[PDB]
């Protein structure tokens, strides 16, 4: 049910399998199936936020209630955009 | 014109409620199905507006032209009013893709003439330069209606 | 009495402000529900300035305090429905002030 | 906001598209009309090939040089097997020498 | 039974959106116009619910039975959905009278057996004791609906 | 504008229309128009809040978006209920 | 949906149907009254003229009912007479 | 008297704005409804002109007497000024018929005595010779007002 | 947006609204309209800080979320006596009785 | 004092933007509160359905800088004569050199950096005082109470 | 008549009197055909005159007014000069 | 002829497209712009009872005028279909 995403600097992120699958690239890499995936070019301050998006997307997709803005700080914006595109999130 | 208002002459009282953090541009599709900009809704306001039965509406971030949702769908068409009771259009953020959301933020921080200066891939630069657009999205929505009316 | 009711009600209607414009021009006849449905849903007792002369021709009003009770009701119906500081709002504030000076001149002089 | 004549050989298509729209989107419009898919069409502005990914704007087409009365010319070439058809736009009929009445 | 649901047999998807601070008790009128309690909406929550066209609903503070509003009105009746797009029921606090609002607060702070200890008029004591009530309010709404206008 | 004066003798200047939300004030003003009305049994901390209600009622009546709870602190609740009853609202 | 206008020298011009209809003569020719004809052939109109006739359709369609300012539809001396001829025949 | 100014006695401030590429001849219809030529506006110019309300105006190419438009219509009648605001007459080219436009160009290049040398139909020759004219157009505009009445 | 205010000097308390975008000056003019004293004889304070006639209520700190109709923000008022301005003095409202044991 | 008047009589109008800027049409409602409307790109014109006595105002959507309509600050459509549309010609005013400079500086420097410019303190305040519909409405009222 | 404005670097600018008076501070100083600005360089005072030309010409012009351009390079010093002059 | 003229005009009105919607349903105070741009206004059966139309070519001349005065005014397709359903309805009744 859980899966391990590992950043370049070597932080481990344990997130629900289904949360991770929101990423086509991850879906591809996992699709038996492994528990770890390593991102050699994605730092933690980015891969941390990529997970936070999985949490957000999973939770607020199909919500009748108003959805809140997914915040992105300027300092992170560009690297996140890079990571985002690679992941297909 | 698959997506267009229908001249009805039967009025439909509506409440546009902006539950997004953004300034909302209500966009009425006319009878030919051409987008018509209407007065903006500030974030967290609601206004009673006079529209007619069958009239087709669409909502957008008045600034960025980013896509919004109304009653968790993309188009709003007022139902026939019952007993004078006004219909309700609840306008909110959708769940943007992480990419599209990032583009939004970068676009909001960098002047469009400087997108060229960002040390990123050209494809990302093209995506940045491709500003969101009511018409592009309307074209897509038509093909998405002929795809569930093909089968 | 009916003549005084005609005087009081005709003075409020004929009353022009200090730019020459007649205020009662909007208050003469109410709008059809087809035209403006929000007003009817908001307003309990839709009454206009003809509905009041009709009563007066029928002499439906008994005293000059019963004629006043329903001129305050429409002038207050207008205030409830309209935006504060609207053209129509502040004239129903003046039409209450011109009715309260018109009844005070005819009923005791 | 850009007016175009897309011409291949003796065929000329008169159409509009946005400065912001892309060379690819234009190929798709041609597909829609002439029933020829986007990847075998090659579009030229004068003698330079246009990349599917560039906006008409960045190719050089502007509102001020692609007006409805003076449309800008996009050249068109099709693909037969491996080879590229030569950019061939056979010119229009020529106007008679300026009549002596108008000099 | 003036105020009642109508047997349609045409489904109408609806979104109950609780934009009141209060826990909301959705109350479906039956075809015999009888209030039928339904599961409570927590504050600030929204749910898609399956109802039918012409069915009449009403909302209230699950705790106090205080009156709420849906789409600026007391009653909600789903229109027939257009293109499957769900109808929206926006549930909100009404502008309570200062008195009724005060009663609400006093009632919430003082045990009913102690209403007698408050140095207030007996009429006010009766008002404190007179808890708000769906049925009383339904009776009122009928006479206001039997008058063609309001 | 209209002047409402509390027992302790505070003066409250509020729009006439705002005040008229009180049937009892409507009576006191409409029956001989004057500008002042005096409440010998309503203290300031109460009559202040009674005005705040007029502000609230006037503003949020016929509001499409959503309406916020009119707050009443326990300390003031009883005296406000008294004042509220005495005034129509 | 588009329409094909063919000049004397045999150039093909594909222009929007609505653009073409600006010509009474064309409207007449297009409007067997069971379904629509895509081609119309002009035996006596050369390309350098029929090309410019289209450019007018583009112009007329675009600038009719446009509010602030319309630009003059230019015609070079070299083409003026033949265009006038074509214009009168077409009814545009 | 059908198409005529009205003796209003009430002055109206107006702004004639020439957004045509042509020199513009403002033409005031008098009370009898007879066209009265007024001073020309160069292209891309604008002037404040004293006028009266209900007065009826009409604009044309001072050279060719070609028809122009004012506020996307053919006639301009100033409204009574509201709070001193000057009313605005925006003068523009219309979208001429391709024919009429061609005539304009041919007429501008060929001397009228040479219209006879053009290898064109006699009807076209007559059309070239026919030069646009305020009076002819006024007659047409009245029949278009008796057809609406 | 709209900002709800109590402008208070001594035992006087004026209830009025304005826009976030409206200015300290126009607020002085509203006071002029009621208390019949021009804007050059008035000082308006938010708490203990003086408010410049040219700044918008928004910029002074009166947000929609601190100047709500039922929780009006308090603007202090001082009038000019000759060469000097009186101290900002806002006599407090009456105290409520100790919370009855019934409500505990 | 400065508000639209509920009229029931339609007045078709042509908003013509002959400024180099994106124009924000601002309709004063019946209560007299500014209401932003859809923007006009530079060099564009639209026919819009408005009513007699309705009061309008125009501004640079980006900067909220003041514009002019028919050489004045407010536009109020007169009753249409014979159905012909009234015309609202929107243009730059002649800004003071100062106000114009502020405009340019404001457009180049982030507001938090106004403090880094080696200029007079008064100028900092002037820079920070961004133009504003409401401030200008207040001024226009006092200019109409001064004409009375 | 005409009036002479002299920049810090000592350039002379001869402009119509009425053009110059558009500046309240100049109006004050001339209330004399000369004024010396020790703190205003030529590239600035030159442009200040160009504004006088612009303002005088386009004030009360009905059809259309063109934007008075200011290049970034000059913007700050012009703003300074502008405020000092009251133009 | 009156029985034939009613069969043609009633078929065009009763005609529903392939989503079930009736096209003819749409057919000065309200909209003065039609009453300025369209020359010869109409809303047709009246002139079938009064016998103003002498042939089936005179009934067609004013159905094309009504469908064409719709196309003129609005920048529409149902008046393009109502001309195509009138030209197939007259072709079935007048010759079968
Ligand atoms: C694309 C683009 N680009 C750049 S800009 C732009 C653009 C611009 C505009 C629009 C949109 C389409 N248009 C607009 O926004 C326009 C603009 C501006 O002009 C206002 N407006 C509006 O739409 C307001 C509006 C509409 C309206 O219409 C009234 C006549 C309808 N009213 C009911 C009928 C009468 N009322 C009848 C009862 N009467 C009352 C009577 C009484 C009364 C009388 C007697 C006794 C007792 C009583 O109570 N009381 N109250 C009454 N109230 C109403 C009054 C008149 C008028 N008026 O305003 C809308 C927005 C608010 C789109 C794009
Ligand atoms: C999670 C959560 N959170 C917050 S809320 C919530 C939530 C919300 C909803 C639900 C669930 C899923 N949804 C519901 O509960 C919905 C909602 C609300 O809209 C009613 N409803 C229901 O399910 C009722 C319902 C009604 C009905 O319609 C008929 C087709 C169903 N049946 C077949 C036939 C009929 N009868 C019709 C008379 N009929 C007779 C009529 C007569 C008669 C009539 C007129 C005049 C003379 C006559 O004699 N006579 N005899 C009759 N006998 C047969 C009878 C048959 C009923 N479908 O469902 C249910 C509760 C009643 C869950 C969570
Ligand atoms: C404040 C704020 N904030 C955020 S948003 C907002 C806001 C909200 C509302 C408004 C304003 C007040 N409201 C609106 O703008 C609303 C909104 C949107 O829903 C459209 N709309 C409009 O007003 C359009 C509108 C009005 C209309 O009413 C019909 C009676 C008009 N008719 C049908 C279209 C013509 N047709 C008439 C037959 N006609 C033909 C007739 C025939 C024919 C018929 C019978 C017999 C024989 C015949 O031949 N044939 N052909 C015809 N062809 C043409 C057709 C045209 C009139 N419908 O839509 C307006 C904008 C257009 C403002 C802000």
For E123, the 3-state DSSP assignment is helix
Residue by residue, DSSP assigns K30-74 as T---EEE-TT--HHHHHHHHHHHHHHHHHTT-SS--------HHH
Ligand nearest to the CA of E47: 2
Q: Do F65 and B48 touch (CB under 8 A)?
A: no
How is residue I5 annotated by DSSP?
Answer: E
Please say whether the beta carbons of J55 and J13 come within 8 A: no
Q: Do A67 and B92 touch (CB under 8 A)?
A: yes
Please, what is the angle between helix C2-14 and helix C50-58, to 10°? 170
Ligand 1 in reach of B38 Cβ (< 6 A): yes
How many Cβ pairs closer than 8 A exist between chain E and I? 8
| Cα-based torsion angle of the residue sequence C39, C41, C43, C46 in order, rounded to the nearest 10 degrees | 80
Ligand 3 in reach of L96 Cβ (< 6 A): no
Contact exists between H and E (3 or more beta carbon pairs < 8 Å):
no
Within 10 angstroms of residue C55's Cβ, the number of other Cβ atoms is 17
Q: Which of chain G's residues have a Cβ under 8 Å away from the Cβ of J47?
A: 67
How far is Cα E91 from Cα E69, in angstroms, rounded to an integer? 6
End-to-end Cα spacing for chain C = 14
Nearest CA to A65 among J68, E11, E41? E41
Please say whether the beta carbons of J127 and J102 come within 8 A: yes
Q: How many residues in chain E?
A: 150
A75 Cα–ligand 2 center, Å: 56
B7 Cα–ligand 3 center, Å: 6
Please say whether the beta carbons of K67 and J20 come within 8 A: yes
- What are the start-end ranges of the E strands in H11-105? 11-18, 24-29, 35-37, 45-52, 56-61, 69-70, 87-92
CA angle B133, B136, B137 (to 5 degrees): 85
Distance of CA C80 to the CA centre of its chain: 14
Pairing of strands D72-77, D2-8: parallel
Ligand 1 in reach of J25 Cβ (< 6 A): yes
Residue by residue, DSSP assigns I32-79 as HHHH---GGGEEEEETTEE--TTSBHHHHT--TTTSBTTB-EEEEEEE
Q: Which two tokens stand for residue J148?
A: 């009375």
| Burial class of residue D101 in the structure, from the number of CB atoms within 10 Å of its CB (0-12 exposed, 13-18 middle, 19+ buried) | middle
Nearest CA to B63 among B83, B41, B30, B45? B41
Residue found under tokens 């087809």: C34
H43 in contact with K, Cβ within 8 Å: no
Instruction: Name residues whose C-beta falls within 8 Å of residue L65's C-beta, 6 or more positions apart in sequence.
Output: L40, L42
How far is Cα J98 from Cα E32, in angstroms, rounded to an integer? 75
Resolution in A: 3.2
Experimental technique for the deposited model: X-ray
CATH level 2 (architecture), domain K17-84: 2-Layer Sandwich (3.30)
Ligand nearest to the CA of E12: 2
How far is Cα D66 from Cα J83, in angstroms, rounded to an integer? 36
Distance of CA B115 to the CA centre of its chain: 25
**What does residue G39 show for φ and ψ, rounded to 5 degrees?**
-90, 145
User: What's the CATH number for G17-89?
Assistant: 3.30.710.10
Fold of A17-86: Potassium Channel Kv1.1; Chain A (3.30.710)
How far is Cα B102 from Cα A81, in angstroms, rounded to an integer? 5
SS3 track for F63-78: CCCCCCCCCCCHHHHH
Q: CA of H108: how far to CAs of D103, G80, H95, H98, L70, in Å?
A: 12, 11, 18, 15, 38
Instruction: Name residues whose C-beta falls within 8 Å of residue I33's C-beta, 6 or more positions apart in sequence.
Output: none
SS3 track for E91-103: EECCCCCHHHHHH
Please say whether the beta carbons of G57 and G20 come within 8 A: yes
Residue found under tokens 């789409």: E71
The region, left, alpha or beta by phi > 0 then psi within -120 to 50, assigned to residue E84 is: left
Pairing of strands G39-41, H11-18: unpaired
CA angle E133, E71, E84 (to 5 degrees): 120
How far is Cα H100 from Cα H114, in angstroms, rounded to an integer? 19
The region, left, alpha or beta by phi > 0 then psi within -120 to 50, assigned to residue D35 is: left
Q: Which two tokens stand for residue F12?
A: 């409250």
Q: CA of B79: how far to CAs of B86, B87, B150, E79, E90, in Å?
A: 10, 7, 26, 6, 16
In F12-73, where does DSSP find H-type helix? 16-19, 23-30, 44-60
Please say whether the beta carbons of D15 and G13 come within 8 A: no
Q: CA of B49: how far to CAs of B38, B89, E74, F47, in Å?
A: 11, 10, 20, 37
Ligand 1 in reach of B28 Cβ (< 6 A): no
Q: Which of chain G's residues have a Cβ under 8 Å away from the Cβ of J46?
A: 67
Residue found under tokens 């002596």: D100
L28 Cα–ligand 1 center, Å: 20
Within 10 angstroms of residue H6's Cβ, the number of other Cβ atoms is 13
E53 Cα–ligand 2 center, Å: 11
How far is Cα I47 from Cα I61, in angstroms, rounded to an integer? 11
Ligand 2 in reach of E47 Cβ (< 6 A): yes
Within 10 angstroms of residue D64's Cβ, the number of other Cβ atoms is 8
Ligand 2, from E4, E7, E35, E86: best to mutate by most atoms within 8 Å of Cβ? E7
Residue found under tokens 């499957």: E84
Q: Cα distance from D75 to chain H (closest Cα, Å)?
A: 28
For chain B, breaks with the C atom over 2.5 A from the next N come after none
Q: Cα distance from E65 to chain A (closest Cα, Å)?
A: 24
H148 in contact with L, Cβ within 8 Å: yes
Instruction: Name residues whose C-beta falls within 8 Å of residue F39's C-beta, 6 or more positions apart in sequence.
Output: F4, F5, F6, F7, F47, F83
Ligand nearest to the CA of C77: 1
Nearest CA to J76 among J100, J56, J49? J56
Q: Which of chain A's residues have a Cβ under 8 Å away from the Cβ of E44?
A: 65
Nearest CA to D92 among E54, E121, F74, G53? G53
* Whether domain I2-103 has CATH 3.20.110.10: no
How far is Cα J91 from Cα J21, in angstroms, rounded to an integer? 9
Q: Cα distance from C54 to chain J (closest Cα, Å)?
A: 26
Q: Do E72 and B17 touch (CB under 8 A)?
A: no
Q: Class for domain F16-86, per CATH?
A: alpha beta
Ligand 2 in reach of E52 Cβ (< 6 A): yes
Residues 2-61 (A) with a CB less than 8 A from some CB of E: none
Ligand nearest to the CA of E14: 2
Q: Which two tokens stand for residue H89?
A: 């007459």
L31 Cα–ligand 3 center, Å: 9
F22 in contact with I, Cβ within 8 Å: no
User: Which of C25, C87, C91 is the best residue to mutate to test the J interface, defined by the most J CB atoms within 10 Å of its own CB?
Assistant: C87
Q: Which of chain H's residues have a Cβ under 8 Å away from the Cβ of K62?
A: 15, 17, 46-48, 86
In chain G, where does DSSP find H-type helix? 17-20, 24-30, 47-63, 77-90
How far is Cα D44 from Cα D51, in angstroms, rounded to an integer? 9
How far is Cα G18 from Cα G30, in angstroms, rounded to an integer? 11
Please say whether the beta carbons of E29 and E36 come within 8 A: yes
| Residue ranges of domains in chain D | 1-102
Q: Which of chain A's residues have a Cβ under 8 Å away from the Cβ of E16?
A: 64
Residue found under tokens 């008195």: E99
Pairing of strands B56-61, D11-17: unpaired
Helix (H) or strand (E) run with residue H136 in it: helix H134-146
Ligand 2 in reach of E115 Cβ (< 6 A): no
Q: Which of chain F's residues have a Cβ under 8 Å away from the Cβ of B44?
A: 65
J147 in contact with G, Cβ within 8 Å: no
**What does residue K23 show for φ and ψ, rounded to 5 degrees?**
-100, 120
Please say whether the beta carbons of E93 and E20 come within 8 A: yes
Q: CA of C63: how far to CAs of C1, C56, C60, C67, I75, in Å?
A: 8, 11, 10, 7, 48
Q: Which residues of L are annotated as a binding site?
A: 51, 68
Nearest CA to C83 among B51, F63, B43? F63
Residue by residue, DSSP assigns J27-69 as EE-TT--EEE-PPBPTT-EEEEEEETT-EEEEEETTT--B-EE
What residue in B sits closest to L78 (Cα-Cα)? Answer: B1
The count of C-alpha atoms lying within 13 angstroms of the C-alpha of I12, restricted to the half-sphere facing its C-beta, is: 14
Q: Which residues of L are annotated as a binding site for Zn(2+)?
A: 51, 68
| Residue ranges of domains in chain K | 17-84
For C93, the 3-state DSSP assignment is helix
Instruction: Name residues whose C-beta falls within 8 Å of residue C109's C-beta, 6 or more positions apart in sequence.
Output: none
Please say whether the beta carbons of B143 and B150 come within 8 A: no
Residue found under tokens 């149907």: G17
How far is Cα B43 from Cα I64, in angstroms, rounded to an integer? 13
Residue found under tokens 């909001």: B108
Ligand 1 in reach of C74 Cβ (< 6 A): yes
Nearest CA to B125 among B134, B115, B135, B133? B115
Ligand 1, from J3, J5, J6: best to mutate by most atoms within 8 Å of Cβ? J6
Within 10 angstroms of residue G86's Cβ, the number of other Cβ atoms is 25
For A61, the 3-state DSSP assignment is coil
CA angle J14, J16, J18 (to 5 degrees): 165
For E86, the 3-state DSSP assignment is coil
Nearest CA to K43 among K17, K83, K80? K80
J18 in contact with G, Cβ within 8 Å: yes
- What are the start-end ranges of the E strands in chain H? 11-18, 24-29, 35-37, 45-52, 56-61, 69-70, 87-92
What residue in C sits closest to B12 (Cα-Cα)? Answer: C37
Its sign, for the CA torsion H101, H107, H108, H114, is positive
Q: Class for domain D1-102, per CATH?
A: alpha beta
Its sign, for the CA torsion L63, L66, L67, L72, is positive
Residue by residue, DSSP assigns chain D as -EEEEEEETTEEEEEEE-SSSBHHHHHHHHHHHH---TTT-EEEETTEEPPTTSBHHHHT--TTTSBTTBPEEEEEE-EETTEEPP---PPPPPPP---GGG-
């Amino acid at each position: 049910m859980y899966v391990k995403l590992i950043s370049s600097d070597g932080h481990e992120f344990i997130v629900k399998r289904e949360h991770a699958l929101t990423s086509g690239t991850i879906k591809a890499m996992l699709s038996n199936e492994t528990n770890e995936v390593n991102f050699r070019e994605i730092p933690s301050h980015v891969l941390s936020k990529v997970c936070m998006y999985f949490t957000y997307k999973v939770r607020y997709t199909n919500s009748s209630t108003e959805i809140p803005e997914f915040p992105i700080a300027p300092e992170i914006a560009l690297e996140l955009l890079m990571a985002a595109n690679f992941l297909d999130c | 014109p698959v997506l267009r208002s229908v001249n009805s002459r039967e009025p439909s009282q509506v409440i546009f409620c902006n539950r997004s953090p953004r300034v909302v541009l209500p966009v009425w599709l006319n009878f030919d199905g051409e987008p018509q900009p209407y007065p903006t809704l500030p974030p967290g306001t609601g206004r009673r507006i006079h529209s007619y039965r069958g009239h087709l509406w669409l909502f957008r971030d008045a600034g960025t032209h980013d896509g919004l949702l109304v009653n968790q769908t993309e188009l709003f068409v007022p139902s026939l009013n019952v007993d004078g009771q006004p219909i309700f259009a609840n306008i909110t953020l959708p769940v943007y893709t992480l990419k599209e959301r990032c583009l939004q933020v970068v676009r909001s921080l960098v002047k469009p003439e400087n997108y060229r200066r960002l040390d990123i891939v050209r494809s990302l630069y093209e995506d940045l330069e491709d500003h969101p657009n009511v018409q592009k999205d309307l074209e897509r929505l038509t093909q998405e209606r002929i795809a569930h009316q093909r089968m | 009495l009916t003549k005084q009711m005609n005087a009081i009600i005709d003075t409020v209607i004929n009353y022009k402000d200090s730019s020459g414009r007649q205020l009662s021009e909007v208050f003469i006849q109410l709008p059809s529900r087809k035209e403006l449905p929000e007003y009817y849903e908001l307003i309990r007792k839709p009454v206009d300035f003809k509905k009041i002369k009709e009563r007066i021709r029928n002499h439906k009003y008994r005293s000059l305090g019963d004629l006043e009770k329903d001129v305050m009701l429409l002038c207050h119906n207008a205030q409830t429905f309209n935006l504060e500081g609207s053209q129509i709002y502040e004239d129903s504030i003046v039409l209450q002030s011109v009715f309260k000076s018109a009844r005070q001149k005819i009923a005791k002089e | 906001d850009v007016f175009l004549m897309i011409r291949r050989h003796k065929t000329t298509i008169f159409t509009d598209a946005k400065e912001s729209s892309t060379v690819f989107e234009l190929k798709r419009i041609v597909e829609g009309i002439l029933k020829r898919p986007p990847d075998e069409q090659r579009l030229y502005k004068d003698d330079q090939l246009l990349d599917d990914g560039k906006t008409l704007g960045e190719c050089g087409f502007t509102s001020q040089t692609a007006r409805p009365q003076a449309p800008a010319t996009v050249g068109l070439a099709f693909r037969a097997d491996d080879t590229f058809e030569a950019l061939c736009i056979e010119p229009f009929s020529s106007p008679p020498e300026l009549p002596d009445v108008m000099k």
